[PDB]
Curated annotation (Swiss-Prot), chain A:
This is Capsid protein VP3. It is found in: Virion; Host cytoplasm. Forms an icosahedral capsid of pseudo T=3 symmetry with capsid proteins VP2 and VP3. Together they form an icosahedral capsid composed of 60 copies of each VP1, VP2, and VP3, with a diameter of approximately 300 Angstroms. VP4 lies on the inner surface of the protein shell formed by VP1, VP2 and VP3. All the three latter proteins contain a beta-sheet structure called beta-barrel jelly roll. VP1 is situated at the 12 fivefold axes, whereas VP2 and VP3 are located at the quasi-sixfold axes. Disulfide bonds join C29-C31. It comes from the Viruses. The chain holds residues 473 to 646 of 2295 of the full protein. It comes from Saffold virus (SafV). The lineage of its organism: Viruses, Riboviria, Orthornavirae, Pisuviricota, Pisoniviricetes.
UniProtKB/Swiss-Prot annotation, chains B, E, F:
It comes from Saffold virus (SafV). This is Capsid protein VP1. It comes from the Viruses. It is found in: Virion; Host cytoplasm. Forms an icosahedral capsid of pseudo T=3 symmetry with capsid proteins VP2 and VP3. Together they form an icosahedral capsid composed of 60 copies of each VP1, VP2, and VP3, with a diameter of approximately 300 Angstroms. VP4 lies on the inner surface of the protein shell formed by VP1, VP2 and VP3. All the three latter proteins contain a beta-sheet structure called beta-barrel jelly roll. VP1 is situated at the 12 fivefold axes, whereas VP2 and VP3 are located at the quasi-sixfold axes. The lineage of its organism: Viruses, Riboviria, Orthornavirae, Pisuviricota, Pisoniviricetes.
């Protein structure tokens, strides 16, 4: 909330009309800039295949709730409502005994390979959005903190590949 | 004999159909697309006034940049882009003469004769120094759509272009023959490249320059070291698709 | 009689009594295979979308000259409401891949003269050439409302002001119409035929199309020989077309466009 | 763990970790056979339409009493824009025939109490009962925006003025909720389950439906035991639903409605 | 024992599940739907003050018409219809008493006990004269949705109702037993009939009375000749579908 | 579907796990560690102002020495060492700009992308003269940890660097192409080299610079003759061990 970077997002006893988090599917997305996936992809020209977005619920054991994780292919812009987000590829994540949800962004592309970076977004380097919505509010008993933290991770899927060794735009560490 | 062109196809006849004659064909295969395009044709020119051991910085001088976009189609600085991009039209370098040279870079032989809509091939590039002063140059090849990495030197007195894992070439000395040649594979994310026009936009809000396809090239060549260098393209294992009209020629 | 031909597609059927056969561009048909660039199983074999959509195209008068033409951007020409279920399904999908089977209609009489060239061309420029304004999403993919003149496309048309045009000898949207006959086509000669039948497979720079950004195919009707007739003969001569998307494929389901 | 269940449908998937199984109404599934009352070959197996459409239904508060309920007319609840390709295909067809597979969601905590009855009912009255006005096309098939009270449906509700109501003891839209449990259903008990899974086949007075005139199925969520919780516990408890048309059939292609 | 009602289905137990007991079932089949509904129940009443040899004209007298709509559901003149139509509710005949008779016609036993949403059957109809004066009557049966043909006599002094090819019955004389009975097949264009409610309209502009299905009946009976006649229905080969709630009964 | 990240490992899924989809993998092997690192990347720079026939004496001029330490990790004169040693950090050459070049020598591509803790390989070295003046130089290669032998000439007017049995190279003349390249085997006494950090000391009284491993290099290159020469490294038969984090990149 102070514009500081953290490995998780917050959810509570309410269902916002907007997504809790939004990630553009590009190995260039700033949100994944420091993941091993992005670190490796920065040294290759193109990718192909599945992407796995892993969410780990860290709230209390007494906290329940459901999220709707959606992947919207491009062409009609970012989904503005839950009604729109559900119109695309999605999975409902129900909290419980198992803590995490392994979500796959299917490789849907006009081209066999996609660029890992770009100057300006093109139909071969930007591929839509992954948004997670609160389907039902996080629900819990008394004596439980109102905010639950969900860890967010990314990696290439089973059929993910990279190709064409290159050097990424240099920068000064800091 | 009679036929009906409205069918959209009529027979290929020889003299024997209507007259007392014989077929007269002789074997010949120099018309094969692969053979025809498998030869080097001038396709670009490059110029640099920076030494090898310095930081590469994009520059333009009388319509010549120190880097090029690898595509047979016209390319040039477009609307003040940092590096050259694919153009949609050719312009005279001179504002008055209305005669070439053009300010745009391209393989004139390809533009003037590309009777197909899409093509696929590997690219053999030849880079030659325009004078005989001993060459001392470094060239960096960047795959189609990859980061240009126009960064600072990380170490003093070194060619920034060589500060990469991208394929690069370094030629210098009295034993060299002032040229460089090599072949790169097709690297575009597109299955086949549009040879003339691309009837669409390249990004999702349709704000790009209509007519230019996204990532329709073979990468880029950045150069540092003193001199003017001419570039040639040779299309390896060339394959073309969908016949289409050739450039119009003024009536004699 | 060998010229009487009927063709069914879903709940539609075209009929002609003067066909000269169907020309298959590239000798290929779109088989409806799913694009290997998409992991999601495509939506296909939608019978309500595999039919002929018939629309009026233009009026042919004596003022049209050789090579004046009309363009029909595809699939956009059918992306509107009149595209039925093909359109409503298309608008809700990121990607679409399909071929086209088309019949253009135009009858005169045995006393009229003139001929048209009916062809399909991939990456055929469909932008407006009566202005120096950059083509935009809502102007680049529209069916021509008026016959297009021919002279200004021979060497292309740059989207630059009239004075700059002088130093721009060639634009990549050039179309040497003297060779338009190299595109899959047929000729509609008034003395011979009132219909032309074409079919083309799916071609593109990639496995499947992000159609919202690209009209990959263009149906074009150009006059080859001007319309002629004497005082007393019917003066209203119109051109129509039945367009069928062949085994379309859709991938990337999402919320609708516009 | 035996209570963890995933269900795929096209490009959608529901997941639950507290399922009590899926109940098949009448032990039957809609198999997608074409209606024998139509000569035209139906449009079917449209993958973009065979998926789950998820919508928010209501907020459950302590003020709701046993049998207060919410109705979801089908297929109308999905005939709007948010019904994607099912909707856009449906609107352009005279007839449609399909079954339903549904999951309603609602989580509380181990400290909350209360239960809901989730059921599907054919020919279940979906008209408004807060007025003596004749139901109309745009009011009869709408998803309830507010919880419906129960007392006024036991003996039905006549669309007559309040004084005439006195001499009308019974209306054919009566619903004896004490037996609502005879309809294919499941119970959502907060202490047990956060989801209910149902599926019903196609039933009607005829082979296929002229849907524009008839909502043959109705998904209904009624409270059985009022919501209870103590000071400090989460107060916002909402109910949601994922509705999937099972192997829908469309016949009689035409121009769209409205 | 324990179970989980949320499943939507729990087992049907007998005493042996939890206790030291035995099943105690005896064969019985009087609960079969076919057997239960295969008996005659009063379902309508008809009245006529016109003679046999006259023109039939629709009439109403103290809530009794000289024709009926063949359906177990309530029917009556609706919004001044020429002939009775299916009603959506039942009303007291009296404007004051708030006690039956009702002004609407129906098979009370069917309305009060129809735990299903749709039904299918043939209809056995019995028509009985309410007094012992020798009967002299003509009845015309019109199939579901067929023309009523309420036309003039084509010949003098003949019963207009008999002027048809539609099935009709004529009973008269001192040798008769003042009643008529017969069975008609299911004739509705609908596959099955809605037994209680029809959640929709019957025409395309959705202007009909919501709740009533199109052509959901077994036809009509028109009568001429003097007298008041009671009607019974007997459901042959009855088949029902989709269980649903029964009419609510006031708490004791 | 669901999983449990606490296990320390979750499955690698493709679209078919949760949706109606198919695997979409295509063969590709350019991600192999061997292939990736088997290309030349700029990794050092050298400068000498002494002629070939003279005594080699260690020197520094604007952060460039006339000898280098063969290691992809940063190296430079450390605390006035006679020859460059491995550094533990990178510093800007300029005391003000806070922008590169750095005063330290390293393979930037290796430092910026070395997702492993240990590596093993042979080293292909390329040395190139920065200008076109005819080369006349002698280079001495000293194996890892071997004596540098910075002694006097034993004979007048001879390059002291060539006065050894250690592998050395001598290039000169108008027929040469101003560069040298060769491959040396791994010579460190260590089984594998630390690619980033070494959590310990190198001698027994633990007085060395914590973080630097003992003899973690490929030897040294000493040069004499006029000129500035850039150096490249190419990792042959590269093998890496134990995955670890990559260098952090500022948030966009």
């Amino acid at each position: 909330s102070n514009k500081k970077r953290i490995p998780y997002f917050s959810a509570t006893n309410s269902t916002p009309a907007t997504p809790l988090v939004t990630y553009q599917v590009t190995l260039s997305c700033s949100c994944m800039a420091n993941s091993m996936l992005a670190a490796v992809a920065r040294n290759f020209n193109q990718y192909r295949g599945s992407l796995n977005y892993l969410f780990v619920f860290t709230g209390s054991a007494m906290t329940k709730g459901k999220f709707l994780i959606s992947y919207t292919p491009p062409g009609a812009g970012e989904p503005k409502t839950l009604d729109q987000a559900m119109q695309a590829t999605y999975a409902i994540w129900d909290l419980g005994l198992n803590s995490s949800y392994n979500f796959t962004v299917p490789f849907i592309s006009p081209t066999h390979y996609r660029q890992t970076s770009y100057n300006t977004p093109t139909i071969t380097s930007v591929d839509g959005w992954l948004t997670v919505w609160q389907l039902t509010p996080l629900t819990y008993p008394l004596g439980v903190p109102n905010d639950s933290h969900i860890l967010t991770l990314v990696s290439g899927g089973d059929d993910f590949t990279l190709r064409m060794p290159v050097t990424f735009t240099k920068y000064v560490p800091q | 004999g009679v036929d009906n062109a409205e069918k959209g196809k009529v027979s290929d006849d020889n003299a024997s159909t209507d007259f007392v004659a014989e077929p007269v064909k002789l074997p010949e295969n120099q018309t094969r697309v692969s053979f025809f395009y498998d030869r080097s044709t001038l396709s670009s020119v490059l110029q640099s006034t920076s030494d090898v051991s310095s930081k590469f910085t994009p520059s333009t001088a009388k319509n010549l940049q120190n880097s090029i976009l690898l595509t047979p189609l016209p390319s040039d600085i477009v609307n003040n882009s940092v590096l050259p991009e694919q153009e949609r039209w050719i312009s005279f370098a001179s504002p008055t003469t209305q005669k070439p040279p053009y300010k745009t870079k391209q393989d004139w032989n390809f533009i003037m004769f590309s009777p197909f809509t899409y093509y696929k091939c590997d690219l053999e590039v030849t880079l030659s120094k325009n004078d005989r002063e001993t060459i001392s140059s470094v060239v960096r090849y960047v795959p189609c759509g990859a980061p240009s990495d126009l960064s600072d030197q990380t170490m003093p007195q070194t060619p920034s272009l060589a500060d990469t894992r991208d394929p690069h070439m370094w030629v210098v000395g009295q034993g060299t023959t002032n040229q460089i040649s090599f072949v790169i594979p097709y690297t575009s994310p597109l299955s086949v490249l549009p040879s003339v026009w691309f009837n669409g936009f390249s990004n999702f809000d349709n704000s790009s320059r209509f007519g230019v396809a996204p990532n329709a090239d073979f990468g880029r060549l950045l150069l540092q070291g003193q001199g003017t260098f001419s570039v040639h393209y040779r299309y390896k294992k060339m394959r073309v698709f969908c016949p289409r009209p050739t450039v119009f020629i003024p009536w004699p | 009689s060998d010229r009487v031909s009927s063709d069914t597609a879903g709940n539609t059927a075209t009929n002609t009594q003067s066909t000269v056969g169907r020309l298959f561009g590239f000798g290929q048909r779109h088989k409806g295979k799913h694009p290997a660039s998409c992991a999601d199983t495509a939506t296909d074999k939608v019978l309500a979308a595999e039919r002929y959509y018939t629309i009026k195209l233009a009026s042919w008068t004596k003022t049209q000259e050789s090579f004046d033409h009309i363009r029909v951007p595809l699939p956009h020409a059918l992306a509107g409401e009149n595209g039925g279920v093909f359109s409503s399904t298309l608008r809700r999908h990121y990607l679409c891949k399909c071929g086209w089977r088309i019949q253009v209609q135009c009858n005169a009489s045995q006393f009229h003269a003139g001929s048209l060239l009916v062809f399909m061309a991939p990456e055929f420029d469909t932008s407006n050439h009566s202005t120096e304004v950059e083509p935009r999403a809502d102007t680049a993919f529209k069916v021509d409302a008026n016959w297009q003149k021919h002279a200004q496309i021979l060497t292309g048309h740059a989207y630059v002001n009239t004075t700059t045009k002088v130093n721009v000898p060639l634009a990549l949207n050039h179309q040497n119409f003297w060779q338009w006959t190299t595109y899959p086509h047929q000729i509609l000669n008034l003395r011979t035929n009132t219909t032309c039948d074409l079919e083309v497979p799916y071609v593109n720079v990639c496995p499947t199309s992000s159609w919202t950004q690209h009209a990959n195919w263009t149906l074009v009707i150009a006059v080859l020989t001007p319309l002629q007739y004497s005082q007393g003969s019917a003066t209203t001569i119109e051109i129509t077309a039945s367009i069928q998307p062949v085994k379309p494929v859709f991938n990337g389901l999402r919320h609708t466009v516009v």
